[PDB]
Amino acid sequence: SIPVRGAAIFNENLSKILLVQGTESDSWSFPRGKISKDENDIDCCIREVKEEIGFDLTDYIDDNQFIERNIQGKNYKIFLISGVSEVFNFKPQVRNEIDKIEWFDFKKISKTMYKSNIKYYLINSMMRPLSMWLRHQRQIKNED
């Protein structure tokens, strides 16, 4: 049960989240991947997200901003990212792994969770701290 690191990526106005669908499942989830030995959490996340969506998180990632969950034996650590351009040309840099990359209206997801024909993984067990984090992001706007 090697740990997995990935990112929850929100757009400029914090209304949409970027999710990926693999080629062997119809579930939507965060871009992510297994720790490749002799590497820390941040480098793993940067490498894996770049492989899966072609975007380099180096200047965006904050080692203090993450959600951690143990799920079916595996440790997942999902870093929280805001301000990413919606019109960036996302595309995978590895073969046969990622089928689709799409922005989702985060409010709609929360409203239609276990009610749509759409399957999710990880994000459904993280809805609360995610929306708490977004709330917090608005509360601090005047601090900048």
Q: Which residues are annotated as a binding site for Mn(2+)?
A: 48, 52
CB closer to Mg ion out of 61 and 134? 61
* Site size with Mg ion, rule: CB under 5 A: 2
What is 20-57 written as a DSSP string? EEESS---EE--EEEPPSS--HHHHHHHHHHHHHS---
Q: Does 92 engage in binding with Mg ion (CB under 5 A)?
A: no
Task: Give the nearer residue to Mg ion in terms of CB position, either 33 or 60.
Answer: 33
| Residues 127, 86: Cα–Cα separation, whole Å | 21
Structural contact between residues 20 and 29, judged by C-beta atoms closer than 8 angstroms: yes
By CB under 5 A, name the one of 6, 31, 33, 92 that touches Mg ion. Answer: 33
From the CB of 47, what's the least distance to Mg ion, in Å? 8
For residues 79 and 44, is the Cβ–Cβ distance under 8 A?
Answer: no
**For residues 14 and 50, which CB has a smaller minimum distance to Mg ion in the complex?**
50
Q: What are the structure tokens assigned to 144, written together?
A: 């900048």
Q: Please enumerate, by residue number, every residue annotated as part of a binding site.
A: 48, 52
Give contact residues for Mg ion (rule: CB under 5 A).
Answer: 33, 48
